[PDB]
């Protein structure tokens, strides 16, 4: 029933995906042993979207795990919820990529992807009706960015009509932990613009900032950050699994949110986020929820939207509420901040309502926005790229195994063109 399959690659995808399947299993009332122990009948009506039922009555997720090393796959198997994943869905090499884009995309990626493409193909035709794909990986790494983008290309030529989503962890220079980020960041971005239908960029610095200020947690960990990302992921497909007043699936998001084919990079956010020690001292109302979700410091990207103008935004409300407030608040925030919304498109905000909120919460909102302020990520990456490519430093590894500087020039050129056109409509008037 318009079910979606999940593909997770690299170290980020494995860690984010593992935390993601914990939230969904909790939401659907599935124990780590795979046996249903839920509460309401609503939890089984659309369980086929994310799970497959095996003989014997246990439900197994339809996920594929990717890596060039067994370093992270053994830990997730040994960790909690690690028995859900089918062992035939684990595919890995024995060499690793070593933070090299070409190794995961030309030499080792090419030889290994033949096996995994068989697993995805078997998973897709087994189910009745596909709805699309969703991808979790990293662009600043070797195996995630290298092999990950190759499979996007491979599956795109086989399923040209199905939608496809990505949750991309693009690097930020403030959290400097790799010296070769600008090279393989641009290459992945160049390949991602012709194939991916929806891209949602994520930054660690933005995630770290939210934990310190909003949650007021003295010292966080990847476990906390992985949960925030997983929260946004489940909120996007909320109306695809539960009854509501205004249902909206993945395709309905793209139609409302993508004006032009090359403008499909988004920045997301989640609300409400509240510290443990101050939860009972504030009220949960739609005016409060809408106030935080437009806060410039609440989104998962370091870019400030107040430095650009929104083209289109979408809000996916959850829980029990009245549509009058939802429609009135969207109009209210669109009028008092008319300088932040581009004029030549009227009513550029979409709203949707789903009756079932996440467990333990009354109301929640997932915000997905398409603003010109995302050019800062590409502008800043390009600046570091040309500063390092000028001296041809750190270059012989790529060129020594079938890579050429020509498509380095091509990748930088196309991304620079994307930046120019993306902020062109900021200055455009009717």
């Amino acid at each position: 029933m318009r079910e979606i399959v999940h593909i997770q690659g690299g170290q980020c995808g494995n860690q984010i995906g593992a935390k993601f399947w914990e939230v969904i299993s909790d939401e659907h009332g599935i124990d780590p042993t795979g046996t249903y122990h839920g509460d309401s009948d609503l939890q089984l009506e659309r369980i086929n979207v994310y799970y497959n039922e095996a003989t014997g009555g246990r439900y197994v997720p339809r996920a594929i795990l990717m890596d060039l090393e067994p370093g992270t796959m053994d830990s997730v198997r040994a960790g909690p919820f690690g028995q859900l994943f089918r062992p035939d869905n684990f595919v890995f090499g024995q060499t690793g990529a070593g933070n090299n884009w070409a190794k995961g995309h030309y030499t080792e990626g090419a030889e290994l992807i033949d096996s995994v493409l068989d697993v995805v193909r078997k998973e897709a035709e087994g189910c009745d009706c596909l709805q699309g794909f969703q991808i979790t990986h990293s662009l600043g790494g070797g195996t995630g960015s290298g092999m990950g983008t190759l499979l996007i290309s491979k599956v795109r030529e086989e399923y040209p009509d199905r939608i496809m989503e990505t949750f991309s962890v693009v690097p930020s220079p403030k959290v400097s932990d790799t010296v070769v980020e600008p090279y393989n960041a641009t290459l992945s971005v160049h390949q991602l613009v012709e194939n991916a239908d929806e891209c949602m960029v994520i930054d660690n610095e933005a995630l770290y900032d939210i934990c310190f200020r909003t949650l007021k947690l003295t010292t966080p960990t990847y476990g906390d950050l992985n949960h925030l990302v997983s929260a946004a992921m489940s909120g996007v497909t909320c109306c695809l699994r539960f009854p509501g007043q205004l249902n909206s699936d993945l395709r309905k998001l793209a139609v409302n949110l993508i004006p032009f084919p090359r403008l499909h990079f988004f920045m997301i956010g989640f609300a409400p986020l509240t510290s443990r020690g101050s939860q009972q001292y504030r009220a949960l109302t739609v005016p409060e929820l809408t106030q935080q979700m437009f806060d410039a410091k609440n989104m998962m990207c370091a870019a400030d939207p107040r430095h650009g103008r929104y083209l289109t935004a979408s809000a996916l409300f959850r829980g029990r509420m009245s549509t009058k407030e939802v429609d009135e608040q969207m109009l209210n925030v669109q009028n008092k901040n008319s300088s932040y919304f581009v004029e030549w498109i009227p009513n550029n905000i979409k709203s949707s309502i789903c009756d079932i909120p996440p467990k333990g919460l009354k109301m929640a909102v997932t915000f997905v926005g398409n603003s010109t302020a995302i050019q800062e990520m590409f502008k800043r990456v390009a600046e570091q790229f040309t500063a390092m490519f000028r001296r041809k430093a750190f270059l012989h590894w790529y060129t020594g195994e079938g890579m050429d500087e020509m498509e380095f020039t091509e990748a930088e050129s196309n991304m620079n063109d994307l930046v120019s056109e993306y902020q062109q409509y900021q200055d455009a008037t009717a």
Partner: protein, 77 residues
């Protein structure tokens, strides 16, 4: 940011009244491990989401047919 610093491990009490002492106390009270359990595993659910009010309401479409007026069953005349 100079957190941790001059407040090491402790159980119960207000602490040393420096930095983030207040927020950590309620976190410590609700779950034993108020600051980054060393590598008593930590569950990210309560630290991020918060207190859970578990309840699953109706879909508002199974709300049309059900509606009852107690007065209409009176014997009248």
């Amino acid at each position: 940011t100079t957190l941790e610093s001059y407040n090491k491990q402790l159980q119960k009490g207000q602490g040393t009244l420096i930095g983030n002492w207040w927020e950590e106390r309620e976190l410590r009270d609700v779950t034993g491990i108020g600051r980054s359990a060393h590598n008593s595993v930590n569950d990210t659910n309560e630290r991020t989401m918060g207190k859970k009010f578990n309840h699953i309401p109706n879909t508002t479409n199974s709300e049309y047919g059900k509606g009852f007026n107690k007065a209409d069953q009176l014997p009248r005349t």
